[PDB]
Amino acid sequence: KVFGRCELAAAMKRHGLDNYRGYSLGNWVCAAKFESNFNTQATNRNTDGSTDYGILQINSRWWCNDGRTPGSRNLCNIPCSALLSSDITASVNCAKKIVSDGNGMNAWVAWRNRCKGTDVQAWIRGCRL
Ligand code: NA
Numbered sequence: 001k002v003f004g005r006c007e008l009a010a011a012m013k014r015h016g017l018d019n020y021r022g023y024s025l026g027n028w029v030c031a032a033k034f035e036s037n038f039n040t041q042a043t044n045r046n047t048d049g050s051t052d053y054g055i056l057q058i059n060s061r062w063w064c065n066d067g068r069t070p071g072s073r074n075l076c077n078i079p080c081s082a083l084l085s086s087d088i089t090a091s092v093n094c095a096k097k098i099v100s101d102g103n104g105m106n107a108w109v110a111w112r113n114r115c116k117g118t119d120v121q122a123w124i125r126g127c128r129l
Pocket of ligand 1: 060061062063064065066069072073074
């Protein structure tokens, strides 16, 4: 599924991501924009042989099991394929653990480089929330 900006903002709120660990809904929408361009089916192979899955590009290296990431953990206790669902529950649940892991949203390198410090409220501007 390819979410609209306000559609994703609404689904993230419905799943309690808005101000989770102090990160406004705009931070999460901005992260999804640059990680997946709002596409729940986005997959990207890392040079290290791990894969990033879904709207928030959760990495098989630590967070999900894809069966082909040697030495890797599955700390969200889910198959990486479950992070490709049109329903974002699994991605939201796992992102809540990632953003609690101690470096906040710096875990998303696209967030650090393209959202951090920017006017992130622009991402939820005009959204009925
Ligand atoms: Na893994």
